[PDB]
Design a protein around this ligand. Structure first.
Ligand SMILES: NC(=O)c1ccc[n+]([C@@H]2O[C@H](COP(=O)([O-])OP(=O)(O)OC[C@H]3O[C@@H](n4cnc5c(N)ncnc54)[C@H](O)[C@@H]3O)[C@@H](O)[C@H]2O)c1
Ligand SMILES: NC(=O)c1ccc[n+]([C@@H]2O[C@H](COP(=O)([O-])OP(=O)(O)OC[C@H]3O[C@@H](n4cnc5c(N)ncnc54)[C@H](O)[C@@H]3O)[C@@H](O)[C@H]2O)c1
Ligand SMILES: O=C(O)CCc1ccc(O)cc1
Ligand SMILES: [Cl-]
Lengths: 286, 286
């Protein structure tokens, strides 16, 4: 009947932060939406789009905003040092949460830094776009949002963050931080990794007279979609989820090694079978 | 008048590509007969029902009553040889045979050995992961590359014919030796298929009694693996027929993947970024 999120801080006002801010307003949130960014232009473009009401590039200026709900949306490796400043600035009743692509250890360090204020999350929604000029107001509609509560999580804040994601249309599901990094190490980080390595392959396998990038129409096209992926976002994911990424890369090698042994032996029905399972499983999801 | 040059067309393999060929031929104003040959009698009746072929047969002998002067081989690649042996005597000396097979190389020379002057090797760089005459399109080749692989033995009159025919359906024709062809598409087509298939195979064997990874397709897995729904027989044929190149391509890819793994393990922040930045190469886009 009447609610309690006064002032919302968007930390890192780019594509995800702006999609959050826009989505939230479009769901009928009527309080303040503020921005903190190291880039004055991220805040400038954002204000000019009516995406935020006001922002800054001083973290100290954030206290004048009195945020009670903070969404972290910069690259994941900026989170810890930002949480530290925030822990001196934020009211004990503020809630802090995030859209970072990695969870695991990060969620525990952030609980430790921010005490009971922290709830880890990750919307599985993305279109590989960069910058706030690209942000959408319906990005989260029908998408899984994963929250990663731990024994220490404040239940009410868990509930508050969950409601909020539902208001922008997300479908919420809980996972342990560790399980999240495994699941997404395999389902998301590993595919990006092989996409980057494929692009690298075609660079090294071109000759001066033969440009392999002239011939995308035979299966490579979907892979070029990594053209748009942000190199700093991915460097940060790869390092922060290092262990699980190595594991996922190893399982893949395992799969690729099998397939190629089938090719070497010049199998036939084994190979056909292998391809047949893969088709069947990949069709199940679409 | 002009097309006394092509009167009776045989499509061998009345599937997605064979039917897309028949459909584009008709659409471009071909008035002659289009016949079909397939070991699957359902391919034939479906093609006739859909107005894609006028008549067809599952009996190779029958093909002689059709009197074909232009044959487009559209079955899985490893059927071409045995089929060719049947055609070498069923077909007129004045007939032309060409193909849409995804591999060239040795198979081109073999087919000019069986078929003589009749044969011209070809490969339209068009299509999708779908199988079956039901998914045939009438505009599949428009503005797509088509690679013809003439040799020192190719009849020049038949080359011009096939080339013209690909142009009448919207194709953009260029030439490659049969060996360069198999190198190029080994790397830009066959390798991305192997990699997509192995990507799916990875989620199968990294799933667990604690988690079905197929439940989370939205972080990159889906987009990158459409082509893993491709047809198992077609791909088996491709991997075996072009094995020396597929193996070289896969090894080259492992060299790239290993490089990235290396940058990740030693947390080489700057190099990683620069490796990922490779995707911003102009060569690539759209
Ligand atoms: N597909 C996706 O784009 C997607 C999906 C899920 C999660 N995420 C997560 O969203 C977060 C942000 O991603 P994005 O795609 O919006 O990126 P983006 O490149 O648009 O924006 C990042 C924004 O954060 C700002 N920023 C960078 N360093 C900062 C710092 N030290 N302090 C304050 N601000 C800083 C940048 O100026 C930019 O405005 C990441 O944690 C990422 O893992 C992205
Ligand atoms: N996008 C693509 O799917 C694509 C693109 C370019 C080239 N190709 C090539 O085109 C050919 C056909 O591919 P498709 O995707 O149309 O496969 P498809 O499965 O749709 O159709 C192949 C057809 O050949 C028939 N067939 C199988 N063995 C046969 C035999 N021994 N004799 C006669 N018919 C036989 C099948 O019954 C089927 O009707 C393949 O050589 C493939 O490499 C495919
Ligand atoms: O599905 C795709 O995008 C690849 C289509 C495609 C597959 C094989 C081939 O030889 C040419 C084209
Ligand atoms: Cl192409």
């Amino acid at each position: 009947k009447s609610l309690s999120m006064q002032n919302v801080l968007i930390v890192g006002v780019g594509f995800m932060g702006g999609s959050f801010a826009k989505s939230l307003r479009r769901s009928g949130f009527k309080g303040k939406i503020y921005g903190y960014d190291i880039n004055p232009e991220s805040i400038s473009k954002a204000v000019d789009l009516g995406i935020i009401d006001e922002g800054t590039t001083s973290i100290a200026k954030v206290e004048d905003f009195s945020p009670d709900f903070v969404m972290l949306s910069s690259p994941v490796r900026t989170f810890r040092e930002i949480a530290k400043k925030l822990s001196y600035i934020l009211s004990e009743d503020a809630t802090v949460t995030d859209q970072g692509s990695v969870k695991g250890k990060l969620v525990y360090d952030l609980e430790n830094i921010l005490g009971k204020r922290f709830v880890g999350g990750h919307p599985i929604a993305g279109t590989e776009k960069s910058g706030v000029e690209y942000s959408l107001d319906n990005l989260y509609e029908g998408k899984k949002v994963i929250l990663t509560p731990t024994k220490k999580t404040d239940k009410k804040r868990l509930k508050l963050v969950k409601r909020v994601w539902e208001d922008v249309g997300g479908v919420v599901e809980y996972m342990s931080p560790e399980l999240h990094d495994y699941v997404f190490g395999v389902v998301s980080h590993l595919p990006h990794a092989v996409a980057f390595a494929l692009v690298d392959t075609l660079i090294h396998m071109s000759t001066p007279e033969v440009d392999l990038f002239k011939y995308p129409g035979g299966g490579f096209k979907d892979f070029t979609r990594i053209a748009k992926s942000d190199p700093i976002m991915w460097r940060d994911i790869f390092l922060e989820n290092k262990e699980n990424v190595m594991k996922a890369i190893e399982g893949f090698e395992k799969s690729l090694n099998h397939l190629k042994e089938l090719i070497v032996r010049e199998a036939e029905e084994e190979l056909v079978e292998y391809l047949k399972e893969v088709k069947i499983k990949r069709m199940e999801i679409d």
